[PDB]
Structure formats: structure tokens, C-alpha cells
Structure 1
Amino acid sequence: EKDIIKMLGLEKAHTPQVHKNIPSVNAKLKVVKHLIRIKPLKLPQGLPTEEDMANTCLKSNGELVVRWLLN
């Protein structure tokens, strides 16, 4: 279990991390599912372009925001 979690980069608690929703990974997640909290990412403004890289924030509802704090 420990090493699943190690190779998930889930080392440090209460920290979000991102992963492919493919099955290869779901093997692992299925092994540890009681140790974790999974929630779907959501992209309301859509995906970050390069200009939006320094402005991108992640809200606890599981949502990504591209433009953070205009002027």
C-alpha cells in the first residue's frame, strides 16, 4: 500500500495531485482507495494557454481557473 502511494506521488498529505483517468492507473488507485480522496478535475475556462501559466489556480471544488486576479 505504502509503495502504491509512493509511486502515486501522494507522499505528502492533503495535497492535490493529478492523474490520467486511464485504467492502468486505476489499478493502483483501486488498491489504495480507502487511503484517498479522488474528485474529477473540471476546466470551466477550458485549458491553459501559455499566456495563462502564471495565473492558474486550483479551487477546492475540484476546478481549475485560468485567469487569476485581474488587476
Structure 2
Amino acid sequence: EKDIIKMLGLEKAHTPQVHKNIPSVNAKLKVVKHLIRIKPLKLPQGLPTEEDMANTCLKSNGELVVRWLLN
């Protein structure tokens, strides 16, 4: 489990990390599922373009907001 956590990028606690929902990944996650919290990523404003990279932020309800703090 220590190894699985290391190779999921989950080393540091209470820090979010994003992963594909493919079965390859779900296998490892299944091994450590008692050590983690898994919440689906949401995109209300859709995926970020290249103009929106600097303004991106991730809210706790698990949703990625593209435009952060206009004027």
C-alpha cells in the first residue's frame, strides 16, 4: 500500500491529484481505497484553453473553475 500510494502521486496528504478513470488506475485505487478520498472532477466552464491556464482554480466541491477573479 505504501508503494501504491507513492506511485499514485499521493505522497503528500490533503493535496489533490487527478487521475484517469480507466481500469488500469482503478485497480491501484481499489487496493488503497481506505487511505483516500475520491471525488469526480467537474467542469462547469468546460476544459481550459491556453488563455485560461493562469486563471484556473480548483474548488472543494471538486469542480474546476476556469476564470478566477475577474477585475
Per the normalisation by structure 1, the TM-score is: 0.99
1:12-52 deviation digits (Å, cap 9, x = unpaired): 00000000000000000000000000000000000000000
5+ unaligned residues in a row in structure 1: which ranges? none
5+ unaligned residues in a row in structure 2: which ranges? none
User: Which structure has the highest helix share of the two?
Assistant: 1
Q: CA RMSD in A?
A: 0.2
4+ aligned runs moved over 4 Å, structure 1: none
SS class of match (1:54)? coil
CA–CA separation in structure 2 for the residues paired with 1:24 and 1:39: 18
Alignment match, 1:10: 10
Per the normalisation by structure 2, the TM-score is: 0.99
